[PDB]
Design a protein around this motif. Structure first.
Motif, PDB file in Angstrom:
ATOM      1  N   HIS B 321      46.974 -33.223 -46.757  1.00 58.29           N
ATOM      2  CA  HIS B 321      48.254 -33.567 -46.154  1.00 58.29           C
ATOM      3  C   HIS B 321      48.755 -32.494 -45.192  1.00 58.29           C
ATOM      4  CE1 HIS B 321      49.109 -37.105 -48.753  1.00 58.29           C
ATOM      5  NE2 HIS B 321      48.398 -36.436 -49.641  1.00 58.29           N
ATOM      6  N   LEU B 322      47.870 -31.646 -44.672  1.00 63.06           N
ATOM      7  CA  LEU B 322      48.284 -30.512 -43.858  1.00 63.06           C
ATOM      8  C   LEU B 322      47.519 -30.484 -42.543  1.00 63.06           C
ATOM      9  CD1 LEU B 322      48.391 -27.708 -46.582  1.00 63.06           C
ATOM     10  CD2 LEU B 322      50.221 -29.238 -45.879  1.00 63.06           C
ATOM     11  N   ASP B 323      48.128 -29.838 -41.549  1.00 66.06           N
ATOM     12  CA  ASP B 323      47.497 -29.592 -40.262  1.00 66.06           C
ATOM     13  C   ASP B 323      47.166 -28.126 -40.027  1.00 66.06           C
ATOM     14  OD1 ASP B 323      47.879 -32.293 -39.821  1.00 66.06           O
ATOM     15  OD2 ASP B 323      49.709 -32.003 -38.644  1.00 66.06           O
ATOM     16  N   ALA B 324      47.609 -27.229 -40.903  1.00 69.27           N
ATOM     17  CA  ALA B 324      47.301 -25.813 -40.789  1.00 69.27           C
ATOM     18  C   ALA B 324      47.429 -25.188 -42.168  1.00 69.27           C
ATOM     19  CB  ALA B 324      48.226 -25.113 -39.792  1.00 69.27           C
ATOM     20  N   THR B 325      46.501 -24.294 -42.499  1.00 75.95           N
ATOM     21  CA  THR B 325      46.412 -23.717 -43.830  1.00 75.95           C
ATOM     22  C   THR B 325      46.386 -22.200 -43.738  1.00 75.95           C
ATOM     23  OG1 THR B 325      45.136 -25.650 -44.529  1.00 75.95           O
ATOM     24  CG2 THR B 325      45.161 -23.760 -46.001  1.00 75.95           C
ATOM     25  N   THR B 326      47.077 -21.543 -44.666  1.00 73.50           N
ATOM     26  CA  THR B 326      47.086 -20.087 -44.758  1.00 73.50           C
ATOM     27  C   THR B 326      46.945 -19.704 -46.222  1.00 73.50           C
ATOM     28  OG1 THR B 326      48.543 -19.985 -42.832  1.00 73.50           O
ATOM     29  CG2 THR B 326      48.298 -17.990 -44.139  1.00 73.50           C
ATOM     30  N   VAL B 327      45.838 -19.052 -46.567  1.00 78.32           N
ATOM     31  CA  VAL B 327      45.492 -18.746 -47.950  1.00 78.32           C
ATOM     32  C   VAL B 327      45.647 -17.250 -48.180  1.00 78.32           C
ATOM     33  CG1 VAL B 327      43.713 -18.842 -49.711  1.00 78.32           C
ATOM     34  CG2 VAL B 327      43.941 -20.708 -48.082  1.00 78.32           C
ATOM     35  N   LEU B 328      46.337 -16.889 -49.258  1.00 74.59           N
ATOM     36  CA  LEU B 328      46.590 -15.504 -49.625  1.00 74.59           C
ATOM     37  C   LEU B 328      45.729 -15.103 -50.818  1.00 74.59           C
ATOM     38  CD1 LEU B 328      48.833 -15.794 -47.585  1.00 74.59           C
ATOM     39  CD2 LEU B 328      50.474 -15.049 -49.291  1.00 74.59           C
ATOM     40  N   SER B 329      45.326 -13.833 -50.843  1.00 78.92           N
ATOM     41  CA  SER B 329      44.386 -13.326 -51.837  1.00 78.92           C
ATOM     42  C   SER B 329      44.936 -12.076 -52.506  1.00 78.92           C
ATOM     43  CB  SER B 329      43.029 -13.011 -51.198  1.00 78.92           C
ATOM     44  OG  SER B 329      42.523 -14.138 -50.506  1.00 78.92           O
ATOM     45  N   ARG B 330      44.674 -11.944 -53.809  1.00 77.79           N
ATOM     46  CA  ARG B 330      45.122 -10.771 -54.556  1.00 77.79           C
ATOM     47  C   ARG B 330      44.236  -9.557 -54.309  1.00 77.79           C
ATOM     48  NH1 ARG B 330      48.361 -10.376 -59.248  1.00 77.79           N
ATOM     49  NH2 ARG B 330      48.359 -12.664 -59.220  1.00 77.79           N
ATOM     50  N   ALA B 331      42.937  -9.771 -54.085  1.00 79.32           N
ATOM     51  CA  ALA B 331      42.024  -8.657 -53.856  1.00 79.32           C
ATOM     52  C   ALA B 331      42.370  -7.908 -52.578  1.00 79.32           C
ATOM     53  CB  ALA B 331      40.582  -9.159 -53.806  1.00 79.32           C
ATOM     54  N   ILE B 332      42.715  -8.634 -51.514  1.00 78.93           N
ATOM     55  CA  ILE B 332      43.134  -7.978 -50.281  1.00 78.93           C
ATOM     56  C   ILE B 332      44.423  -7.199 -50.502  1.00 78.93           C
ATOM     57  CG2 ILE B 332      43.569  -8.319 -47.839  1.00 78.93           C
ATOM     58  CD1 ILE B 332      42.088 -10.867 -47.918  1.00 78.93           C
ATOM     59  N   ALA B 333      45.367  -7.780 -51.247  1.00 78.34           N
ATOM     60  CA  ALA B 333      46.615  -7.082 -51.533  1.00 78.34           C
ATOM     61  C   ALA B 333      46.378  -5.822 -52.352  1.00 78.34           C
ATOM     62  CB  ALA B 333      47.582  -8.011 -52.262  1.00 78.34           C
ATOM     63  N   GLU B 334      45.313  -5.797 -53.154  1.00 77.19           N
ATOM     64  CA  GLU B 334      44.992  -4.588 -53.903  1.00 77.19           C
ATOM     65  C   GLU B 334      44.588  -3.450 -52.975  1.00 77.19           C
ATOM     66  OE1 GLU B 334      45.638  -4.026 -56.914  1.00 77.19           O
ATOM     67  OE2 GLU B 334      46.242  -6.080 -57.386  1.00 77.19           O
ATOM     68  N   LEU B 335      43.846  -3.756 -51.912  1.00 76.83           N
ATOM     69  CA  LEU B 335      43.416  -2.729 -50.972  1.00 76.83           C
ATOM     70  C   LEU B 335      44.549  -2.212 -50.098  1.00 76.83           C
ATOM     71  CD1 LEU B 335      39.988  -4.221 -49.882  1.00 76.83           C
ATOM     72  CD2 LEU B 335      40.465  -2.516 -51.634  1.00 76.83           C
ATOM     73  N   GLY B 336      45.717  -2.848 -50.128  1.00 73.87           N
ATOM     74  CA  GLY B 336      46.852  -2.386 -49.361  1.00 73.87           C
ATOM     75  C   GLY B 336      47.041  -3.036 -48.010  1.00 73.87           C
ATOM     76  N   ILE B 337      46.353  -4.138 -47.733  1.00 66.11           N
ATOM     77  CA  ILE B 337      46.484  -4.837 -46.460  1.00 66.11           C
ATOM     78  C   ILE B 337      47.569  -5.894 -46.601  1.00 66.11           C
ATOM     79  CG2 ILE B 337      45.308  -6.168 -44.699  1.00 66.11           C
ATOM     80  CD1 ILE B 337      44.202  -3.452 -44.833  1.00 66.11           C
ATOM     81  N   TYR B 338      48.641  -5.754 -45.826  1.00 65.96           N
ATOM     82  CA  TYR B 338      49.724  -6.721 -45.819  1.00 65.96           C
ATOM     83  C   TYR B 338      49.952  -7.236 -44.405  1.00 65.96           C
ATOM     84  CZ  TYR B 338      50.967  -5.363 -50.578  1.00 65.96           C
ATOM     85  OH  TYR B 338      50.954  -5.125 -51.931  1.00 65.96           O
ATOM     86  N   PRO B 339      50.065  -8.555 -44.203  1.00 65.17           N
ATOM     87  CA  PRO B 339      49.999  -9.631 -45.201  1.00 65.17           C
ATOM     88  C   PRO B 339      48.583  -9.868 -45.710  1.00 65.17           C
ATOM     89  CG  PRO B 339      50.145 -10.568 -43.015  1.00 65.17           C
ATOM     90  CD  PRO B 339      50.300  -9.082 -42.849  1.00 65.17           C
ATOM     91  N   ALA B 340      48.435 -10.302 -46.960  1.00 59.41           N
ATOM     92  CA  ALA B 340      47.118 -10.456 -47.577  1.00 59.41           C
ATOM     93  C   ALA B 340      46.563 -11.849 -47.284  1.00 59.41           C
ATOM     94  CB  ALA B 340      47.204 -10.194 -49.074  1.00 59.41           C
ATOM     95  N   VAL B 341      46.223 -12.062 -46.017  1.00 60.58           N
ATOM     96  CA  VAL B 341      45.701 -13.338 -45.544  1.00 60.58           C
ATOM     97  C   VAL B 341      44.183 -13.260 -45.492  1.00 60.58           C
ATOM     98  CG1 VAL B 341      45.722 -15.027 -43.698  1.00 60.58           C
ATOM     99  CG2 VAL B 341      47.788 -13.747 -44.220  1.00 60.58           C
ATOM    100  N   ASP B 342      43.522 -14.233 -46.105  1.00 61.16           N
ATOM    101  CA  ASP B 342      42.066 -14.288 -46.094  1.00 61.16           C
ATOM    102  C   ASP B 342      41.592 -14.841 -44.756  1.00 61.16           C
ATOM    103  OD1 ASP B 342      39.362 -14.410 -46.718  1.00 61.16           O
ATOM    104  OD2 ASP B 342      39.730 -15.156 -48.746  1.00 61.16           O
ATOM    105  N   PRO B 343      40.810 -14.089 -43.977  1.00 57.50           N
ATOM    106  CA  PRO B 343      40.427 -14.561 -42.640  1.00 57.50           C
ATOM    107  C   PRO B 343      39.263 -15.534 -42.628  1.00 57.50           C
ATOM    108  CG  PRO B 343      39.563 -12.381 -42.993  1.00 57.50           C
ATOM    109  CD  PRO B 343      40.368 -12.707 -44.219  1.00 57.50           C
TER     110      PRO B 343
END
Ligand code: ATP
Ligand code: ADP
Ligand code: MG
Ligand code: MG
Lengths: 69, 467, 495, 57, 48, 68
Positions: B321-343
Motif C-alpha cells: 500500500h506504499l509508493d516509498a519505503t524507508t527502513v530503520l535498523s538497530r545495528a546501524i544505530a549501534e555504530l552511531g550513524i544517525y539517521p539509521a537508514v538501511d541503504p
C-alpha cells in the motif's frame, strides 16, 4: 406500466421547459464553472482559433571553420 | 427511535435485545442513566431479536436490564473550516476547554473508497533536505510514504524533522492524527505549535487540526480514531480545492487493537493469534487515503515492527500500500550513524532515468553497487583479517567505509541533547559530493572527517583542523 | 432527451422459491428455507446483491455474499436463479476493463455478448492432446536464449518483493504487436491480465502504460482490488481462465497471467474459517493444493481433430526473505514445468534483469526454438558454465582468457525497460560477442557499442535481416557478410 | 480536442441532473389519493394477474 | 525531405592528414552518427 | 398478504376465493393481513415457499435506466 407512463409524462413535462433544467440550482453553475476551470488548467489555455507560426534558425551550426582548415 | 435491554456484558462487548425495530449494522446507540455519554456500535445480528455491539468507553457499573436507545444513523462529527486550531476526540467532542465547535454541517465516519475512473497518474518529486532520502529513495507529491522501525530507533524524531522542514512552507492545510502514543508528546506538540505561530488563539489564521486517542483508552476507541482523522482530511479535498498533508503516528495500533476483541466476538484465530479478517479491513481503510481528480493528499505514516521482525503478518501486508519505503535498523544505530537508514533495503517508485535524470540515477546505482560489494567480504575479514586481501579489495573497503560516514547528518530538532547545529543540504551539492568521492579525489583524507557534516566543503576544513 | 424516454419505454412477475435469513455477520449469512437448491448455485438478495451456496446442512444453508453486507438484515428474502455461476465470454471483451463477474468499470458502456460459460470445468484428458512444438517469444535476451518457452506450457516466476516480476510480463505483452499487425492468423496471440489484491492506482498506471504503446486493442484486464470482498478475489482467476478457454477451442492461441497467486490463498483461508471449518498448517484449509492443481491443469495444446488451439500460463509467487522451502511455494513448484529465479544481491550488483541462470530451468529441451538461435546459444551455455566454476575467489593460458571472455559475456545480457527486441537482432548481437570480436575493448564501454551498432545495422542493412528471418537459419554467404560488417564497424566505431 | 471535451462534459452533466429531477418528481407526485385510486385499479389488475398465474398449474 | 549523401570509408578517412585535426574528426564522428540516427528516427515524409 | 393501506373486506373475501383456487389440494389457508405503509402501494403475497412481489419496487427498475 402505470409507473412507466407516469415517468414518461414527467419526462415530457421536463421537455416542456423552454431551456435548461427546471431546477437551475444555486450551485450547479458554480460546480460547472469549477470543472471548466480545472479542465482549462489541466489542458492549458487555448484561444478560439489562434494559430501561431514562428520559425527558428539553424541551431548549433557546426562548420569546418578552424585554424587547420 | 426504539428501546432495548442489556442482556450480557463481557469486557468491551455488550449484547442488547430489541422488542421491535431492530437497528441495522453500523448504527450508534445511547445508554440511559450515566453521568458521561457512552455510545455503542452495532456489529452483528445474532438471532431471536438480539445484536452484539462494541463500546467506545469504559463499561464499569452496567447492570443487566438497563435501557438502551437508538439514534438512527452512524457516528457523526463536526467538519468544516472551523476545526482549525482545535482538538477533538473519537466521537468529536472538544477536549481543549474552549467551548463548542460551531460548524454548519456534519459527516459520517463510514464511507466508500473512490472509484476506478477518478484516479490521477501524475508524478513529481519532493525535496526534504536529507541526503539519504534524496539520493537513494526520493519521495513524491500526492503519494504514500511509510517509515519502518523497531523500538527506540527514531521514527518520531524523523517525523518531527519532516514536519519542521516541509509543513511550514506549505500553502495548504495539514492534519495530525495520533493513535496509541504518549500523551506528554501531544502536550509538547500543542505548546510548540502555539509558540511557532501555526496555531493562533486570537484570530482565524490557523493551518492545522488535531485528533487524539492515546494508549490510556480502551481498545474500542483506538480502533476508530484514524477514520475520524480521515473524514476531516477528506472534507478539505472534496468540498474545497486544496492540498492536504496527513500525518499518522503508529498505524500499527489500529491492527493490534482489532485483535483484542476478535476472541470475544467468537472467531477462530488464524496465525500468531491474529484475527482471520486482517487484510480486508486494512484494505478498506487504506484505499480512502488517495489522490483524485478533485485534489491531492500526501501521507506520512509511522509503522512498528514487533521484536525487530519484518516477516510478522502485521507489517508484511503494508508494503503493498506504499509508493516509498524507508527502513530503520538497530545495528546501524549501534555504530552511531544517525539517521539509521538501511541503504540496501529502501525503494521508491520514481527512481528511473526519465524522471530524475541520467546523472542522478548513475550516481545512485554506483554507490549502491559499491555498498553491496563490501558486504560480501565480511566473513573473510572477520577471521583471516585485512592482510589477506589484494590491493583492489583494500581500496574498495576504504571507499565503502568512507561512503558510509558521509550519509549521516545532524538534525535541528536534536540540537538540544546533542550539542551540534542543524544543517540542510540542497540536492545538487549531494550529487556532486558523492560524485567526487566515487572519483577518488579524496583518498588522502582520514575516514573520520566525513562524520556528521553537511556539504562536502565542511569535510576538508574539519580534516585540516584535525591534522 | 428521447434516448432516456426510449430506455424507459422498453415488466413480468412470476412465482419463485424463497428462504428467510436467520443470522448475518462478517459476510456470512445463514438462511432458513430453500429446499430444492443445488450446491454451488447463485442466489439473489432483496436489495440487489448476489451470493453462492456452499454448505448444505439439515437445518440451514450457508451463503457467502459478493459485495458489502451492511444492507442485509435478519428477516429478509432470498430467491434462487436456477443456474450455476457463469461469466460472459466472447471476443467483444477485447479492449475493456471488467470486474470479477464481467461488469464494465471503465465507463464505456454495456458489453454486447451472446455466450456464457461456467467457471468450474474439467481439463482435457489424454486423447485430445499433442506435443508442444511452437515458440513463444518474449523479447528478453536472457530468456529467449537460455530459458526458452513453448506454446501450451506453464512457467513460474518467483522471487522476493521489489525484484522485477511485473515488468517481465509487461514487456512480454508489448512484444506481441509485431505479429498481430500482420497477415497470417497462425502467428497471432491474445493476452489476458488478472490482478488480485493490488490497489487501484497501480492498475490505472499499468493501463495507462499499456494504452500509450497501442496494446489495449488485443488485451483483457480482470481486476479484483484490495477493497473488494474475499469471495471476488477467490473467484477471479477461474473467471479469467474461462475467458481464455474460448479461444483455445476455436483454433486460436492465447496467453494468461495470474498476478500474485499468494493473495488468493489468504482470501480462501479467510472465507473458509468464517464457515466454521477446522484449520490446518498455518490455519490454511486442508486442500490448498487442490485449489491450484485444478487451475494450472487447464492449459494444453490441442491436436488437429479439435482445432489446434493453445493456452499458456505464467503464475507469480512471492517469498519471504528468499525462503523457497516454505509451505505455499513448494506446492506450486511441483506443479509447473519450470521456474525463473530473481534475487536482490544480483539486483544491486548492476545485473538487471536479475535472472539467476544457474538455477532457472525449462523442461522443454529446446524442442520449440528457431534453428538460428541454437547455433549461437548452445556455445554460450558452455562459456558461462565454465566461467562460473572458477571465476570467484573471495594461468594466462587458460584462466585469464576464461574470465576475460566471461566478463564480456555477462555485460551483453543486460537490457533496459519497455523495449523488447526482434529475434534476428538478438542473433546478430550475440553473434558479435560469441565469436570474440569484442575481446579487446574495455568492458565498461560495451553497452554504447551495442546501442550504436544496433542502430547502424537496423538503418543501413535492412536486407540482411530479412534473409535470416525468412530462412530461419544462417548460411555460408550470411556468415561471410557478417564478419566484414562487424570488422568494418568495429574499426570505424572507435570514438 | 479541447473544445470537444468541454462540450461532452456539459452534455453528461445535463443528462445526470435530468434523470435525478425526473425520479424525485415521480416520488413527489405520487400522492396518497393517487395511491388509493391506483391501488384500487391495482387490486383489480393484480387479482386478474393472480388469476392468470394460478391458471398455469 | 529527400537526401542525397555520399558513402565514405572511415578507415581511409582516418588516413587523411590528421595532424592538428584529430579533435575536428572526433567531433565529426559524433555529429555524423547522431544526425543520421535522428534523421532515421523521424519519417522524412510530412506527418498525417 | 401485505398492503400499504387496509383493503376492503369484500376485496378480502374475493382474495380468499382466488387464494383457495391457487391452494388446490390442501386445507384451509391461514391468512395474515398486514398493513405496512412503507411501500408506496401494491400487494405482496407469500404462499408457502412461493413468493410474488408486486409493489413500488419497480422504482429500482426505472432507476436502472441510468445505468443503461
Ligand atoms: N530491467 C530493469 N532496469 C531498470 N529498472 C528495472 C528493471 N526491471 C525492473 N526495474 C525496476 O525495479 C522496480 C521494481 O519492479 P517491479 O514493479 O516489476 O517489481 P515487483 O517484483 O512487481 O514488486 P512488488 O512486490 O512491489 O509488486 C521498479 O522501480 C522498476 O522500475
Ligand atoms: N537523529 C538522531 N540523533 C541523535 N539521536 C537520535 C536520533 N534519532 C533518534 N535518536 C535517539 O533515539 C531516542 C528517541 O527515539 P524515538 O525517536 O522515540 O524512537 P521511536 O520513534 O521508535 O519511539 C533519543 O533518545 C535519541 O537518543
Ligand atoms: Mg515514538
Ligand atoms: Mg508487481
Amino acid at each position: 406500466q402505470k409507473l412507466f407512463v407516469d415517468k414518461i409524462r414527467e419526462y415530457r413535462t421536463k421537455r416542456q421547459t423552454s431551456g435548461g433544467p427546471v431546477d437551475a440550482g444555486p450551485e450547479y453553475q458554480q460546480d460547472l464553472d469549477r470543472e471548466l476551470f480545472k479542465l482549462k488548467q489541466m489542458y492549458g489555455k487555448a484561444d478560439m482559433n489562434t494559430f501561431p507560426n514562428f520559425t527558428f534558425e539553424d541551431p548549433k551550426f557546426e562548420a569546418v571553420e578552424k585554424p587547420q582548415s | 427511535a426504539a428501546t432495548g435491554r442489556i442482556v450480557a456484558v463481557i469486557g468491551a462487548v455488550v449484547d442488547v435485545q430489541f422488542d421491535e425495530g431492530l437497528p441495522p449494522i453500523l448504527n450508534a446507540l445511547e445508554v440511559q442513566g450515566r453521568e458521561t455519554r457512552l455510545v455503542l456500535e452495532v456489529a452483528q445480528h445474532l438471532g431471536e431479536s438480539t445484536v452484539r455491539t462494541i463500546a467506545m468507553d469504559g463499561t464499569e457499573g452496567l447492570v443487566r436490564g438497563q435501557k438502551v436507545l437508538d439514534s438512527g444513523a452512524p457516528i457523526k462529527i463536526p467538519v468544516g473550516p472551523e476545526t482549525l486550531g482545535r482538538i477533538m476526540n473519537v466521537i468529536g467532542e472538544p477536549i481543549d476547554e474552549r467551548g463548542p465547535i460551531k460548524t454548519k454541517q456534519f459527516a459520517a465516519i463510514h464511507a466508500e473508497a473512490p472509484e476506478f475512473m477518478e484516479m490521477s497518474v501524475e508524478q513529481e518529486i519532493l525535496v526534504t533536505g536529507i541526503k539519504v532520502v534524496d539520493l537513494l529513495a526520493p519521495y513524491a507529491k500526492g503519494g504514500k510514504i511509510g517509515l519502518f522501525g523497531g523500538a527506540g530507533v527514531g521514527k518520531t524524531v524523523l517525523i518531527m524533522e519532516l514536519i519542521n522542514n516541509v509543513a511550514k512552507a506549505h500553502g495548504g492545510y495539514s492534519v495530525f492524527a495520533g493513535v496509541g502514543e504518549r500523551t506528554r508528546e501531544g502536550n509538547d506538540l500543542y505548546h510548540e505549535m502555539i509558540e511557532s505561530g501555526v496555531i493562533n488563539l486570537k484570530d482565524a489564521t490557523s493551518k492545522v487540526a488535531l485528533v487524539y486517542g492515546q494508549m490510556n483508552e480502551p481498545p474500542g476507541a483506538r480502533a476508530r480514531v484514524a477514520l475520524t482523522g480521515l473524514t476531516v482530511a477528506e472534507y478539505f479535498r472534496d468540498q474545497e480545492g486544496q492540498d492536504v498533508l496527513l500525518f499518522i503516528d503508529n498505524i500499527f495500533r489500529f491492527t493490534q487493537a482489532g485483535s483484542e476483541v476478535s476472541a470475544l466476538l467468537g472467531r477462530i484465530p488464524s496465525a500468531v493469534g491474529y484475527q482471520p479478517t486482517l487484510a480486508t479491513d486494512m484494505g478498506t481503510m487504506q484505499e480512502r487515503i488517495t489522490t483524485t481528480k478533485k485534489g491531492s493528499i500526501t501521507s506520512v505514516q509511522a509503522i512498528y515492527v514487533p521484536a525487530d521482525d519484518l516477516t510478522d503478518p502485521a507489517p508484511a501486508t503494508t508494503f503493498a500500500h506504499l509508493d516509498a519505503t524507508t527502513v530503520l535498523s538497530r545495528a546501524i544505530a549501534e555504530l552511531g550513524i544517525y539517521p539509521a537508514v538501511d541503504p540496501l533495503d529502501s525503494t521508491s517508485r520514481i527512481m528511473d532515468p526519465n524522471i530524475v535524470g541520467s546523472e542522478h540515477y548513475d550516481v545512485a546505482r554506483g554507490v549502491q553497487k559499491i555498498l553491496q560489494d563490501y558486504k560480501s567480504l565480511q566473513d573473510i575479514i572477520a577471521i583471516l583479517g585485512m592482510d589477506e586481501l589484494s590491493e583492489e579489495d583494500k581500496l574498495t573497503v576504504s571507499r565503502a567505509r568512507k561512503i558510509q560516514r558521509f550519509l549521516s547528518q545532524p538534525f535541528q530538532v536534536a540540537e538540544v541533547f546533542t550539542g551540534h547545529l542543524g544543517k540542510l543540504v540542497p540536492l545538487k551539492e549531494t550529487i556532486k559530493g558523492f560524485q567526487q568521492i566515487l572519483a577518488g579525489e579524496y583518498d588522502h583524507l582520514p575516514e573520520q572527517a566525513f562524520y556528521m557534516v553537511g556539504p562536502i566543503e565542511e569535510a576538508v576544513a574539519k580534516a585540516d583542523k584535525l591534522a | 432527451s428521447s434516448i432516456l424516454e426510449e430506455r424507459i419505454l422498453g415488466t413480468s412477475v412470476d412465482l419463485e422459491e424463497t428462504g428467510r435469513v436467520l443470522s448475518i455477520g462478517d459476510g456470512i449469512a445463514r438462511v432458513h428455507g430453500l429446499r430444492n437448491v443445488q450446491a454451488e448455485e447463485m442466489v439473489e438478495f432483496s436489495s440487489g446483491l448476489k451470493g453462492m451456496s456452499l454448505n448444505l446442512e439439515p437445518d440451514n444453508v450457508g451463503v457467502v455474499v459478493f459485495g458489502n453486507d451492511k444492507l442485509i438484515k435478519e428477516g429478509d428474502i432470498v430467491k434462487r436463479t436456477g443456474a450455476i455461476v457463469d461469466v460472459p465470454v466472447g471476443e467483444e471483451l477485447l479492449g475493456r476493463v471488467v470486474d470479477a463477474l464481467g461488469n464494465a468499470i471503465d465507463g464505456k458502456g454495456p458489453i454486447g455478448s451472446k455466450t456464457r460459460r461456467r467457471v468450474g470445468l474439467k481439463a482435457p484428458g489424454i486423447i485430445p492432446r499433442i506435443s508442444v512444438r511452437e515458440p513463444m517469444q518474449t523479447g528478453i535476451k536472457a530468456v529467449d536464449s537460455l530459458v526458452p518457452i513453448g506454446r501450451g506450457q506453464r512457467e513460474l516466476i518467483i522471487g522476493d518483493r521489489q525484484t522485477g516480476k511485473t515488468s517481465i510480463a509487461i514487456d512480454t505483452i508489448i512484444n506481441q504487436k509485431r505479429f498481430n499487425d500482420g497477415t497470417d492468423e497462425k502467428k497471432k496471440l491474445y493476452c489476458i491480465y488478472v490482478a488480485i489484491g493490488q490497489k487501484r492506482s497501480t492498475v490505472a498506471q499499468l493501463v495507462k502504460r499499456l494504452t500509450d504503446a497501442d496494446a489495449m486493442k488485443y488485451t483483457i484486464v480482470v481486476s479484483a482490488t484490495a477493497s473488494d470482498a474475499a469471495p471476488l478475489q477467490y473467484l477471479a482467476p477461474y473467471s479469467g481462465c474461462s475467458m481464455g478457454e474460448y479461444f483455445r477451442d476455436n483454433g486460436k492461441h492465447a496467453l494468461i497471467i495470474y498476478d500474485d497467486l499468494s493473495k488468493q490463498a489468504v482470501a480462501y483461508r479467510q472465507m473458509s474459517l468464517l464457515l466454521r471449518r477446522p484449520p490446518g498448517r498455518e490455519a490454511y484449509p486442508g486442500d490448498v493444493f487442490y485449489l491450484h492443481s485444478r487451475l494450472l491443469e487447464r492449459a494444453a495444446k490441442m491436436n488437429d481433430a479439435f482445432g489446434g488451439g493453445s493456452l499458456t500460463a505464467l503464475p507469480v509467487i512471492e517469498t519471504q526473505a528468499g525462503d523457497v522451502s516454505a509451505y505455499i511455494p513448494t506446492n506450486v513448484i511441483s506443479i509447473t514445468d519450470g521456474q525463473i529465479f530473481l534475487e536482490t544481491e544480483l539486483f544491486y550488483k548492476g545485473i538487471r534483469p536479475a535472472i539467476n541462470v544457474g538455477l532457472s530451468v525449462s523442461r522443454v529441451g529446446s524442442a520449440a526454438q528457431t534453428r538460428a538461435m541454437k547455433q549461437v546459444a548452445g556455445t554460450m551455455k558452455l562459456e558461462l558454465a565454465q566461467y562460473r566454476e572458477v571465476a570467484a575467489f573471495a594461468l594466462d593460458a587458460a584462466t585469464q582468457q576464461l574470465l576475460s571472455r566471461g566478463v564480456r559475456l555477462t555485460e551483453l545480457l543486460k537490457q533496459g525497460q519497455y523495449a523488447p527486441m526482434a529475434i534476428e537482432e538478438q542473433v546478430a548481437v550475440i553473434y558479435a560477442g560469441v565469436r570474440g570480436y569484442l575481446d579487446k575493448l574495455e568492458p565498461s564501454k560495451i553497452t554504447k557499442f551495442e546501442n550504436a551498432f544496433l542502430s547502424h545495422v537496423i538503418s543501413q542493412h535492412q536486407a540482411l535481416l530479412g534473409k535470416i528471418r525468412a530462412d530461419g537459419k544462417i548460411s555460408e554467404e550470411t556468415d561471410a557478410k557478417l564478419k566484414e560488417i562487424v570488422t568494418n564497424f568495429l574499426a570505424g566505431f572507435e570514438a | 480536442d479541447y473544445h470537444i471535451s468541454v462540450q461532452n462534459m456539459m452534455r453528461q452533466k445535463e443528462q445526470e441532473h435530468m434523470i435525478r429531477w425526473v425520479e424525485k418528481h415521480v416520488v413527489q407526485s405520487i400522492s396518497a389519493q393517487q395511491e388509493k385510486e391506483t391501488i384500487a385499479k391495482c387490486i383489480a389488475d393484480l387479482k386478474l394477474l393472480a388469476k392468470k398465474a394460478q391458471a398455469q398449474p | 525531405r529527400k537526401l542525397a549523401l555520399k558513402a565514405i570509408d572511415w578507415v581511409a578517412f582516418g588516413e587523411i592528414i590528421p595532424r592538428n585535426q584529430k579533435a575536428i574528426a572526433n567531433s565529426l564522428k559524433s555529429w555524423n552518427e547522431t544526425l543520421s540516427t535522428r534523421l532515421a528516427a523521424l519519417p522524412e515524409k510530412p506527418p498525417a | 398478504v401485505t398492503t400499504a393501506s387496509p383493503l376492503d373486506e369484500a376485496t378480502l373475501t374475493e382474495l380468499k376465493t382466488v387464494l383457495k383456487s391457487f391452494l388446490s389440494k390442501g386445507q384451509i389457508l391461514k391468512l395474515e393481513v398486514k398493513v405496512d405503509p412503507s411501500i408506496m402501494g401494491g400487494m405482496i403475497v407469500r404462499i408457502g415457499e412461493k413468493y410474488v412481489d408486486m409493489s413500488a419496487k419497480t422504482k429500482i427498475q426505472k432507476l436502472s435506466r441510468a445505468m443503461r
